[PDB]
């Protein structure tokens, strides 16, 4: 499954999928760092017992990915449901560290309409795309702010004109 992970997460379609793919390699290097530091030459059973509390987590990461797969707000919310799903167990910090960097460009997209108002789109990962002037079509996170972002951007885009 380690070889099945390097085959799947080698590329640098979607930008948040790129962010998640680059966050996975932040962890696989730690998996390569904890190995090959402690044991020069140990017993056989010490290896099977030492890599048991860690290796089953590496098999858990196979059922997380494919080895289809969503993209955009769909992926960013699926990975969120995966958290409350398996919260109190030992899979909280790894999934949380993946979610903390898998949302990182999406916060820039949100950080446009609040500060600058320059709407940025690449492939449609944003939930919103682009007389009357108000035809920016709109239609997980709390919906108490979701509709508010949509008008908080359009007020700035009206004041620019």
């Amino acid at each position: 499954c380690y070889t099945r992970l390097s085959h799947f997460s080698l590329q640098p379609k979607g930008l948040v999928f790129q962010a998640f793919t680059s966050g996975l390699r932040r962890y696989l290097q730690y998996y390569r760092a904890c190995v090959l530091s402690t044991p020069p030459t140990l017993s056989l059973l010490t290896i099977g017992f030492l890599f048991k509390k860690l290796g089953r987590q590496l098999r858990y990461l196979a059922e997380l990915c494919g080895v289809a797969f969503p993209t955009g707000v769909k992926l960013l919310s699926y990975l969120y449901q995966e958290a409350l799903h398996n919260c109190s167990n030992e899979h909280y910090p790894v999934l949380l560290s993946l979610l903390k960097t898998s949302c990182e460009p999406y916060t820039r997209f949100i950080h446009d309409w609040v500060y600058s108002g320059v709407f940025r789109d690449a492939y449609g990962e944003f939930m919103i795309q682009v007389k009357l002037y108000w035809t920016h079509g709109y239609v997980v996170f709390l919906k108490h702010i979701a509709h508010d972002i949509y008008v908080c951007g359009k007020t700035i885009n009206l004041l620019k004109l």
């Binding site: 640098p12 962010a19 290097q29 760092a33 090959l36 530091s37 460009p105 820039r108």
Partner: protein, 129 residues
């Protein structure tokens, strides 16, 4: 195992050629400065290998030990080789080689290790323009 280690050797030879080629007069004012900012990153790549060789004199180094040691150089020379090929493939001179570096600074924003290398190369290449 040495097949896994050889990518940093391949990502070194494509960097020294870029700095040797784009230090010529025809490549403007800014592509001079982009090949200028990569050579302080060439210095550290050499210093690690000399220190490992002098450690290898004492016999306290292994092939697994070396593969553990070179992990930051495998990343940093790869970002330099990516920038080298991206400036070569699409012909980028002057302002066009100032746009692409600003794009890679937005590509790497959350790592803060590849961002700082790329942001250093942007401010260094932006000096003549």
């Amino acid at each position: 195992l040495v097949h896994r280690i050889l990518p940093v050797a391949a990502s070194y030879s494509a960097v020294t050629r870029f700095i040797e080629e784009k230090s010529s007069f025809e490549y403007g004012q800014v592509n001079h400065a982009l090949a200028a900012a990569m050579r302080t990153l060439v210095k550290e790549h050499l210093i690690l290998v000399s220190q490992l060789e002098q450690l290898h004199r004492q016999g306290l180094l292994s092939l697994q030990k070396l593969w553990f040691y070179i992990q930051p150089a495998m990343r940093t020379m790869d970002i330099l080789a990516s920038l080298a090929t991206s400036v070569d493939k699409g012909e980028c001179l002057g302002g066009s080689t100032l746009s692409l570096l600003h794009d890679r600074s937005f590509s790497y924003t959350g790592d803060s290790q590849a961002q700082e290398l790329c942001l250093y190369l942007t401010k260094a290449a932006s000096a003549p323009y």
